[PDB]
Design a protein around this ligand. Structure first.
Ligand code: ZN
Lengths: 57, 387, 349, 45, 396
């Protein structure tokens, strides 16, 4: 993304213990009065979970 | 979006372009080679010459909706391909000209150049009234000094033909009126386009050649029919022509003249509006579904609005929720036959009745002056009696 | 000749009623005194607006109101009031066009203009559109369905239509158009469009859209939304009682969505139609359980669960008809509906 | 051409930094970012 | 539905401009009766920008994907009554978005077949019943509460925790009004034979001698109350003497309460400060309104002989517990209990919030009259301005 105040292209880093896959990216303009600049985005992560030592059964 | 000199330059430019678009449909329309194209180009090159000179901050150029066709008109006369009334009716009927709406441009952008003071005041403001159209031609000639530059102005033995065929195309009346024209009509010489009426009050010098041609045309008819001592034109013959005349479909032409009638002017065709002979009604809606399709394309009325509009047109699928009609010379032939039985107070009345009709027709294609026309008539009336 | 789809070439007409009003507040004042743009808004603030209808028709039977005034008008007395407002109309006459000087001097003499402002406008787009209007009005005045539809469909494609006759000829043309569409759809599309749930009346110079025949969603009913419900109940009646059904429910839940705000909010047919739809839903269920005791020989059929479902309704309807009366609803001839409903009860026995 | 599907109309579109976040075919205000022909490697486990 | 009974139960909230006029100075005047006649709730809709826009039904799928609440516009027909009827003003006020239960009479999915439900991107079998609040699915947990309207005999050391001369024995009846709002009423047997009645007002507790609430319900003789309790049981020396202590003791405390009306005047006088009825109601009205709002509200208004009979039944049950001729019940036995349903709690909390909201209007009038007193109860401007000056977003 880009904030004019910083004149910089900034990024939101992913902070987690495990890799994932992006399932959906949803662009939210709804319930807004105008908001056309698309300031809200919802991103879904798909984390595969293989049965593993320590999993409860 | 700019004011002053450079606003004017693009105002200028846009005017530049639409005329060019006008000219090329001109070529496809008539197909009269490099010639029609290049003469038109230098004509405006000549027109531009004058605009630059009185520049500084001269903004009188704001040439009108009519200036462009006057330009094409004069260029055509140089060449002398056609006529004015015919050209105008044809153009309105088929929207041949991009004349009436100025959105074409190629400007999307020129539009935004803020139609401001000018470009907004361009393309399609309104339809010509009285002399609001022959006057401009005179002004163009004056700036143009057109008569010196171009040969045989306002001429056309073709307008006479157009006119006789126009209705009671009494083959003999072509030569009759050609003869009276021969007569005192500028000492038996083809009327040339009037001069560069430099003066701004545009007096009715009444030199617009055609205007006088139609006048001689009318005069000829009643004089000719008002002293056909030999009785070559039967009592019952005159009303038959007016009879058969009683409107009728049109292999394109009459439908056009209806479309011109519909500029709701002085109410001579207004009622035709009302009447509108059945189908005339139908082929009218046909020409509306084809030629005000351009109509337009709201941008900036939330996408949502546009969608709604679409839906509306949606739930109105519409457009369909002898080839029948006939051509021009077909109709012309068939009324020429509808009178084919050829071989006191009443006839005078009939003659007056008929003349009013043509007055309607010829006047209706043109700036009329339900008086000037008359004034024009009066004028040569006076001109004539100096035998 | 007919009513045109467009904002009235706002050029001379706007300065003509500057002069009209300004004179009426000038002569209006001195006359009131003896009895001891801006001016136009003040003229309406001295008279009170047109409520949601047409002509402030309201009875003719309450207050006596003694108006013997006294003819109080001695040619001499009129020219005492008038002698000074006319000289004050001059100053702004100097500033007005020669056509508007004569127009003012005609209406100040009491002459009326036989020159319809919509009989001179000379604009291409407008030009035709007046073509457009009379052709469709002359075509519905002879029921030409196949041609009235084409003229209507083109009239909305040109940039000059405010619902207007867009809806009032757009519905019949679809009733006369035995082919495609139920004014209903078009009627429900209109309803979606001009809800106007906002209570806007008065204030500015409504001279672009007056006809309470478009507008509302405030208080002033919309009449295409009332016609949508009336056409919808008549669309439910045809070939009912001679899952894919739903319509008489669709209309019970589409009227619900409302339940007053603007429509519920305002009374009448809103309540009365909803009921009438509800009363029809009561008959249909007496028929579907009517003929020769329900269908025939008795019901044994778990006695009647169906009678109890119908008596609940009949008792409910009578509540909707009553609240429509109580809240000032003059629409309903109660005597006939109560007799019909009781004689119908006597079918359910 | 980047793609965004209308959550309620399925209509494909190509949003710009200059347009309203809305389905031009329905009017919804929720748009799924479309998958494209893009390479991804996978360990088949 | 229950909610319209609730707003019928909140009644009125009256405020006087001290209505000057210059009896109009010790009876003054100009009444303003504010209430709510109807309360309507509409199914979730969303119109674009702001107004004039065509509305669309809003679906739960939208709220979840959008991560937002699933709100329905809350509307209520406000009654603004001036001078008991000199002028009535109706107003449908929108009170913000009330979260609606799924598959309820307020969810679009209430009547959708699985096929349509799938057509709306839902679990083909979605039971619903829960709320989308800020996109997070929450349901209101059902709760186990005392079975309503029926006296449960309880021994509780709290009863001694009231003070000296308190026994453990006591009766608890949880009277619930039609609207499902509850009011717990307790009877206590004092060691002294005195019986005191516990109740709660403005969620503070209040104790009154039961013989006062008896003489307050209906005009009766002492023999009618005595006969009401012991009746044919003329052999209970235990009860004969305790009940003589009760009635004679009341004759000791209040020799001057000679008739029921006077008693009502005593109750109105002692609760007038807290029942907020003042500058409008007489001690007779305040007292009787108290009885009507507290004592066995499950019996309802004008049940005052019936409420009298029931209260006597609780006195008899209480003495039968005291002797020990009957066991006490167990509040924790499922036997003695009913279930506060989430939606009912919802309706109660709405009723209370609308009561506070009308009180809030009353506060707004108080501030306006205390800084200007500029405007009369009649102004339509006053309705619009005052209404626009209190906060009415109860939906949020
Ligand atoms: Zn869509």
């Amino acid at each position: 993304y880009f904030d004019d105040t910083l004149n910089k292209t900034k990024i939101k880093t992913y902070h987690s213990s495990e890799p994932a896959y992006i399932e959906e990216v949803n662009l939210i303009g709804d319930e807004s009065n105008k908001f056309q600049e698309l300031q809200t985005v919802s991103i879904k992560y798909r984390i595969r979970r293989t049965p593993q030592i320590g999993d409860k059964f | 979006k700019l004011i002053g000199h450079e606003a004017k330059l693009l105002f200028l430019k846009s005017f530049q372009f639409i005329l060019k678009r006008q000219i090329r449909w001109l070529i496809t329309e008539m197909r009269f080679p490099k010639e029609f194209e290049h003469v038109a180009k230098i004509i405006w090159l000549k027109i531009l010459k004058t605009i630059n000179d009185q520049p500084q901050e001269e903004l009188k150029l704001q040439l009108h909706m009519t200036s462009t066709i006057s330009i094409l008109y004069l260029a055509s006369t140089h060449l002398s391909l056609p006529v004015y009334t015919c050209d105008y009716i044809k153009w309105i009927c088929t929207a041949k000209m991009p004349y009436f709406q100025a959105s074409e441009i190629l400007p999307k952008s020129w539009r935004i150049q803020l139609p401001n003071y000018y470009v907004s005041i361009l393309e399609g403001s309104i339809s010509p009234f009285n002399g609001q159209l022959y006057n401009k031609i005179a002004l163009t000639c004056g700036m143009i000094h057109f008569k010196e530059f171009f040969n045989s102005e306002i001429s056309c033995q073709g307008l006479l033909l157009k006119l006789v065929m126009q209705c009671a195309l009494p083959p003999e009346f072509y030569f009759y009126t050609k003869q009276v024209i021969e007569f005192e009509e500028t000492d038996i010489r083809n009327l040339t386009l009037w001069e560069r009426t430099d003066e701004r009050h545009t007096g009715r010098v009444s030199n617009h050649a055609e205007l006088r041609v139609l006048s001689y045309f009318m005069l000829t008819i009643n004089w000719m029919l008002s002293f056909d001592r030999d009785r070559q034109y039967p009592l019952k013959w005159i009303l038959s022509l007016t009879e058969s005349l009683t409107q009728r479909t049109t292999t394109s032409e009459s439908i056009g003249r209806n479309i011109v009638k519909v500029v709701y002017p002085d109410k001579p065709t207004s009622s035709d509006y009302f009447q509108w002979s059945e189908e005339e009604t139908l082929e009218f809606l046909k020409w509306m579904e084809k030629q005000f399709l351009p109509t337009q394309t709201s941008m900036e009325m939330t996408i949502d609005q546009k969608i709604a509009r679409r839906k509306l047109y949606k739930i109105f699928p519409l457009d369909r929720e002898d080839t029948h009609q006939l051509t021009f010379i077909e109709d012309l032939q068939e009324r020429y036959a509808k009178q084919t039985p050829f071989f006191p107070p009443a006839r005078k009345e009939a003659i007056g009745r008929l003349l009013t009709h043509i007055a309607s027709q010829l006047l209706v294609d043109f700036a009329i002056s339900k008086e000037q026309l008359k004034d024009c008539i009066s004028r040569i009336k006076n001109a004539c009696l100096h035998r | 000749m007919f009513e045109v789809p467009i904002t009235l070439t706002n050029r001379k007409f706007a300065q003509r009623r500057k002069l009209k009003y300004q004179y009426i507040n000038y002569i209006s004042r001195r006359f009131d005194r003896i009895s001891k743009s801006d001016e136009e808004r003040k003229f309406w603030k001295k008279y009170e607006k047109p409520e949601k209808s047409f002509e402030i028709w309201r009875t003719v039977s309450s207050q006596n109101k003694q108006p013997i005034n006294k003819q109080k008008m001695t040619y001499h007395n009129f020219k005492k009031i008038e002698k000074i407002p006319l000289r004050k109309m001059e100053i702004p006459l100097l500033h007005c066009t020669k056509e508007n000087k004569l127009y003012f001097q005609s209406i100040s003499r009491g002459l009326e203009p036989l020159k319809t402002s919509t009989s001179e406008v000379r604009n291409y787009r407008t030009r035709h559109i007046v073509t457009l209007t009379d052709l469709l009005h002359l075509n519905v005045s002879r029921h030409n369905w196949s041609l009235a539809y084409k003229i209507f469909a083109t009239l909305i494609r040109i940039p000059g239509v405010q619902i207007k006759s867009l809806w009032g000829i757009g519905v019949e043309i679809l009733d006369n158009l035995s082919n495609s569409s139920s004014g209903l759809d078009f009627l429900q599309w209109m309803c979606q469009i001009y809800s106007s749930k906002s209570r806007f009346v008065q204030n500015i110079n409504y001279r672009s859209i007056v006809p309470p025949f478009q507008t509302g969603s405030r208080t002033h009913t919309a009449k295409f939304a009332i016609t949508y419900l009336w056409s919808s109940l008549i669309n439910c009646q045809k070939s009912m009682e001679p899952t894919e059904n739903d319509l008489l429910q669709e209309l019970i839940d589409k009227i619900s969505e409302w339940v007053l705000t603007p429509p519920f909010m305002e009374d009448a047919e809103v309540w009365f139609i909803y009921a009438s739809c509800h009363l029809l839903k009561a008959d249909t269920l007496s028929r579907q359980f009517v003929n020769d005791n329900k269908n025939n020989d008795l019901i044994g059929l778990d006695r009647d669960i169906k009678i109890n479902q119908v008596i609940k309704h009949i008792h409910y309807v009578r509540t909707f008809l009553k609240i429509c009366l109580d809240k000032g609803g003059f629409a309903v001839p109660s005597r006939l509906i109560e007799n019909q409903l009781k004689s119908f009860e006597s079918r359910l026995y | 051409t980047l793609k965004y599907i209308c959550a309620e109309c399925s209509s494909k579109l190509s949003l710009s930094r200059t347009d309203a976040v809305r389905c031009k075919d329905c009017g919804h205000r929720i748009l799924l970012k479309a998958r494209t022909k893009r390479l991804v490697q996978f360990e088949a486990r | 539905g229950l909610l319209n009974l609730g707003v019928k139960d909140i009644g009125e909230k009256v405020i006087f401009d001290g209505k000057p006029l210059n009896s109009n100075s010790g009876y003054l005047g100009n009444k303003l009766s504010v209430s709510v006649e109807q309360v309507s709730i509409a199914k979730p809709m969303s119109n674009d920008g702001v107004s004039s826009a065509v509305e669309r039904k809003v679906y739960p799928s939208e709220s979840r994907q959008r991560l937002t609440s699933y709100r329905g516009k809350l509307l209520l027909k406000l009654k603004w009554s001036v001078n008991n009827g000199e002028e009535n003003l109706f107003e449908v006020r929108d009170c913000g978005g009330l979260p609606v239960m799924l598959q309820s009479n307020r969810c679009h999915l209430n009547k959708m077949s699985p096929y349509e439900l799938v057509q709306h991107k839902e679990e083909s079998d979605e039971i619903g019943g829960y709320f989308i609040v800020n996109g997070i699915e929450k349901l209101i947990r059902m709760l186990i509460v005392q079975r309503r309207n029926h006296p449960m005999a309880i021994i509780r050391p709290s009863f001694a925790n009231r003070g000296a001369s308190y026994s453990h024995y006591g009766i608890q009846i949880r009277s619930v009004r039609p609207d499902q709002t509850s009011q717990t009423n307790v009877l206590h047997y004092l060691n002294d034979g005195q019986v005191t009645f516990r109740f709660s007002w403005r969620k503070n507790e209040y104790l009154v001698p039961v013989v006062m609430i008896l003489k307050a319900l209906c005009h009766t003789s002492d023999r009618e109350i005595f006969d009401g309790i012991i009746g044919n049981d003329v052999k209970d020396s235990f009860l004969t003497d305790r009940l003589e202590l009760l009635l004679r003791g009341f004759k000791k405390r209040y020799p001057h309460l000679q008739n029921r009306t006077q008693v009502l005047q005593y109750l109105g006088d002692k609760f007038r400060v807290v029942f907020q009825a003042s500058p409008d109601q007489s001690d007779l009205e305040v007292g009787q309104e108290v009885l009507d709002r507290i004592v066995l509200v499950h019996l309802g208004k004008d049940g005052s002989q019936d409420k009298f009979r029931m209260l006597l039944f609780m006195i008899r049950k209480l003495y039968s517990l005291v002797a020990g001729e009957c066991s006490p019940d167990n509040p924790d036995a499922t036997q003695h209990q009913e279930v506060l349903l989430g939606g009912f709690l919802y309706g109660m909390i709405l009723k209370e919030k609308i009561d506070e909201y009308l009180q809030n209007i009353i506060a707004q009038v108080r501030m306006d009259i205390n800084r200007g007193m500029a405007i009369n109860f009649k102004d339509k401007r006053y309705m619009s301005r005052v209404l626009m000056r209190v906060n009415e977003n109860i939906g949020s």
